[PDB]
Design a protein around this ligand. Structure first.
Ligand SMILES: [Mg+2]
Ligand SMILES: [Mg+2]
Ligand SMILES: [Mg+2]
Ligand SMILES: [Mg+2]
Ligand SMILES: [Mg+2]
Ligand SMILES: [Mg+2]
Ligand SMILES: [Mg+2]
Ligand SMILES: [Mg+2]
Ligand SMILES: [Mg+2]
Ligand SMILES: [Mg+2]
Ligand SMILES: [Mg+2]
Ligand SMILES: [Mg+2]
Ligand SMILES: [Mg+2]
Ligand SMILES: [Mg+2]
Ligand SMILES: [Mg+2]
Ligand SMILES: [Mg+2]
Ligand SMILES: [Mg+2]
Ligand SMILES: [Zn+2]
Lengths: 103, 122, 53, 122, 206
RNA sequence: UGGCACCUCGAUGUCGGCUCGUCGCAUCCUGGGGCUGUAGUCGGUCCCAAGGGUUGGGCUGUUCGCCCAUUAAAGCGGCACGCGAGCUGGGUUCAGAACGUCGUGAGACAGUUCGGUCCCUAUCCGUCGCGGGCGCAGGAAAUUUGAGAGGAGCUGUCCUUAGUACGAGAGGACCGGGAUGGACACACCGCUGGUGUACCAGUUGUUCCGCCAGGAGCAUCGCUGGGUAGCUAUGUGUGGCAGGGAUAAACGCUGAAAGCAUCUAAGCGUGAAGCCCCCCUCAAGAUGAGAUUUCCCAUUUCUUCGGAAAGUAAGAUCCCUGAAAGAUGAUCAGGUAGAUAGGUUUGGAGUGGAAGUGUAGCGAUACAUGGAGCGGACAAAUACUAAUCGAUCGAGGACUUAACC
């Protein structure tokens, strides 16, 4: 924790992120930026964990695609997320949902 | 924090015993390192006693020892160290924000040369 | 593992140069005039900082 | 992180089912391979009636690892298995179908047919 | 060629214009003052002497007050010298600000590394350890001291000892952001030392 | 491979491997060049060159070797066949037992087979770190020059020049420019992870706090799910860039001796990963003890001059609170001219919804009050507790000569 670090990094802090917890389903609109053309790709899944503080906070989303589990980790305040939707809210008892990997 | 020559549970037992001793007798003699740890322990206990509610009392009861300070004729009923902490010691420092103990250096012990010190709650 | 040669007197006395011990950090008590350690209670009158202990 | 003696599940249409890696290519003392790297390997299990037979020495490209990749914008990807695709001397597959998701890093290394044949490119 | 002194505040990240994510170190560089100029005709070499941080009068002595009284300033905690500079700049008693650097500059960072205490060979020198089973009684030991013929052991036989606390220079670091009002400099990467450590920031020599 | 029998039989441990290397050059790769049966591509051979580099497995106790798959390359030798008071003990080389063979036999075979005790608290030098003393013609606080020394030094692939030069075709470049790697090294914890025994939660047995409720002890931290600071790699940032001076082998210019010719004799020029620099670190005990800025000054007693001692100045320490430092010393931050540590008050990460009460349910339990309660080591304020009071050390500045004055 540092006050100067907080004041320096305050302007780059995204205010449009909604409220979500580990355990609920979200949809991420991520900008896939090729060399000259940028498109939008969608990733929908369950938030498995949330970690960190301030500008260096990250969150992970898990999905099952074509029979294989895929996990995807993002910074919360990155500009490459066009928008984040909370589809539904879950009822869990944990902060980290690692038991879903073995399940 | 200091490891005081002993494992986790032994250190916890030593801290609980010394904190209860300082609450009951209000002035004890010990070695310097033990005094510099029970400083923290006892002052957190006194803050909990100053707060005063049932949650704070149940938290202090998980650390204080079940010992008898005195018997009072009121049917003679005993008084316990938790009762003394919440009813006598805590109101004493209702107007002092911190620093309820002080440490006074005495000198070496004959048997092993350990530096002995006095700690009292004042 | 084992000494090849015995040690001479001069060599032993040279090694024992630093095996002395220091002199206590004491001064006189303002109250009773006796000697005492700094930052310690006076054992002859029980004083510290000019107060009874 | 695929080094010698690690086994991988084969994710394409050819007769192989499981493969043991023999060598990681691209330097004298190189030890581990990541997504998008080529390895020499041997077929441990095969499907009877396929093009690739048991005991064959082939080479393959890694298409998904259980310790995945980090992207330049600061995000990561990870999978629940290690999988490879058997390839020719050029970067073309030896099968007609590819199963499961494939990492986007195959496109930067110019594995175009594998990318086009995949059900999903994450 | 520019130079400045600062304190290491911490370590964080920023997002660039493209949306990239890069790690940065924060250097705080307030209260730099020019104290002395060394010339060839008086010293044998050319340099500028810079003092960095204000300190209380109780913590200084008469020689320090005398030295800083020529530059009309209060006593300074750190003082260093910069060579390979242009002395036609740098008036005595002038201020040095983070404005001397601009975003995109390439720098050299000098510091003193974090202290480790007494350490063994495989941590201090990256040695390889022995077998942990198969009857072995040789795990974290230095190795053979040498051959038999010299009747002695050579120099640079690496042995245990004190590890950290050395002067380190890291070259070719980029400046990401300059904040004049806060006196703050953001450098891509990391620098030697712990928090609150003194860092020299100089223009890269190559 | 041998010959000899000169040291060692009141003991010089003997194969292979592991750990750690260091040196030679008769050079395996990379750098420079001459000749070619050198058209090009790919090669051959010799000269210069030791700066750096020089793989993981299957079989065998093996060294060696054969094989598999790589690499720019998978060099050869010395150091008690380097290295057992550094490790191992598969093999050789004790006592048991067995096979083939030889012997009348007890037994034997460097033929084979299964099993078989590896001791030692470091005195001196040497090596790696850390202190104390004195010196450096007054006493002090900082900033430095650099004699000298150590480190680093490696290399692949792809694109373009260009399907150009060359060649009957087949095939196919030098030189130059651009991009991106392998192995290695240094630093650091923002990110991905690991650990995290005084952080949070769930749970089994039994004992205890008089009982319920709530808690405490023991069971590997009882077990199980997470995790702060710190420490870390497998994580991240950076490096070996671009060059200069003089050369090696070599190629030349000018040029006589020897009216010509000649790279040599006098005199010049090109010319290597090599040498000396450039880059990083240490460095004035460099007794040759260097330099710059600033501070204090010429006290008092005795001496027969020499000189001695005794109060101090500038400045430091004893002692005490500590961590960014640390085996201990040392280093650095402070001692009321105070935020050095603890407490306190506000926060933060982390965990995930406290107790009490109420409501629903026959009950296990669920819901509300309420992102609640707790919260080591992280942040900021605050003199509440402890850094009280003393004491000790520490200059008065030799002589000669020359310049100024
Ligand atoms: Mg301690
Ligand atoms: Mg003690
Ligand atoms: Mg893996
Ligand atoms: Mg395997
Ligand atoms: Mg340390
Ligand atoms: Mg240490
Ligand atoms: Mg062991
Ligand atoms: Mg003998
Ligand atoms: Mg093998
Ligand atoms: Mg190759
Ligand atoms: Mg040899
Ligand atoms: Mg050893
Ligand atoms: Mg002189
Ligand atoms: Mg057990
Ligand atoms: Mg646990
Ligand atoms: Mg170079
Ligand atoms: Mg909370
Ligand atoms: Zn007294």
């Amino acid at each position: 924790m540092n006050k100067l670090i907080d004041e320096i990094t305050k302007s780059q802090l995204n205010p449009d992120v909604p409220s979500f917890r580990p355990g609920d389903t979200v949809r991420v609109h991520a900008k896939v930026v090729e060399g000259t053309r940028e498109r939008i790709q969608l990733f929908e899944g369950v938030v498995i964990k949330r970690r960190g503080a301030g500008i260096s906070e990250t969150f992970t989303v898990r999905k099952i695609s074509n029979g294989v589990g895929v996990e995807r980790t993002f910074p919360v305040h990155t500009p490459r997320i066009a928008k984040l939707e909370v589809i539904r809210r879950g009822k869990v008892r944990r902060a980290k949902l690692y038991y879903l990997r073995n399940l | 924090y200091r490891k005081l020559g002993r494992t986790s549970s032994q250190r916890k037992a030593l801290l609980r015993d010394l904190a209860t001793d300082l609450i009951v007798h209000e002035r004890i003699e010990t070695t310097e390192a033990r005094a510099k740890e029970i400083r923290k322990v006892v002052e957190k206990l006194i803050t909990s006693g100053k707060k005063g509610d049932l949650h704070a009392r149940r938290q202090a009861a998980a650390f204080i020892r079940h010992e008898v300070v005195e018997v009072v004729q009121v049917k003679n009923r005993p008084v316990y160290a938790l009762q003394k902490l919440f009813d006598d010691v805590a109101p004493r420092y209702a107007e002092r924000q911190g620093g309820y103990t002080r440490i006074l250096k005495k000198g070496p012990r004959r048997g092993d040369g350990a530096p002995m010190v006095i700690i009292e709650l004042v | 593992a084992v000494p090849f040669r015995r040690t001479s007197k001069a060599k032993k006395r040279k090694r024992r140069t630093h095996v002395k011990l220091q002199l206590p950090g004491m001064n006189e008590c303002s109250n009773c005039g006796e000697y005492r350690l700094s930052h310690h209670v006076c054992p002859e009158c029980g004083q510290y900082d000019g107060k009874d202990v | 992180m695929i080094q010698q003696e690690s086994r991988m599940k084969v994710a394409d249409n050819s007769g192989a089912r499981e493969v043991l890696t023999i060598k990681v290519l691209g330097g004298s003392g190189r030890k581990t391979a990541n997504i998008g790297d080529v390895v020499v390997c041997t077929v441990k299990q095969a499907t009877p009636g396929g093009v690739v037979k048991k005991g064959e020495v082939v080479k393959a490209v890694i298409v998904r690892t259980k310790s995945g990749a980090r992207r330049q914008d600061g995000s990561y990807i990870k999978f629940d298995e290690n999988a490879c695709v058997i390839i020719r001397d050029d970067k073309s597959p030896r099968g007609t179908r590819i199963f499961g998701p494939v990492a986007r890093e195959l496109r930067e290394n110019n594995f175009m047919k594998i990318v086009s044949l995949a059900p999903e490119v994450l | 060629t520019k130079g400045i002194l600062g304190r290491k505040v911490g370590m964080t990240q920023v997002f660039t214009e493209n949306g990239e994510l890069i790690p940065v170190t924060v250097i705080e560089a307030a209260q730099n003052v020019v104290l002395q100029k060394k010339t060839v005709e008086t010293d044998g070499y050319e340099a500028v002497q810079i003092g960095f941080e204000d300190k209380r009068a109780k913590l200084s002595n008469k020689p320090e007050q005398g030295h800083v009284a020529k530059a009309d300033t209060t006593p300074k905690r750190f003082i260093r010298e910069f060579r390979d500079v242009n002395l036609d700049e740098y008036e005595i008693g002038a201020e040095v600000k983070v404005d001397v650097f601009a975003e995109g500059d390439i720098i050299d960072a000098t510091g003193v590394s974090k202290g480790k205490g007494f350490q063994g060979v495989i941590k201090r020198h990256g040695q390889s350890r022995g077998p942990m089973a198969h009857g072995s009684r040789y795990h974290r030991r230095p190795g053979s001291m040498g051959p038999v013929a010299p009747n002695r052991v050579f120099k640079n036989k690496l042995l245990p000892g004190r590890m950290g606390g050395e002067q380190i220079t890291i070259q070719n670091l980029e400046i990401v952001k300059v904040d004049v009002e806060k006196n703050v400099l953001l450098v891509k990467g990391n620098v030697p030392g712990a928090k609150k450590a003194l860092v020299q920031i100089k223009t890269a020599t190559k």
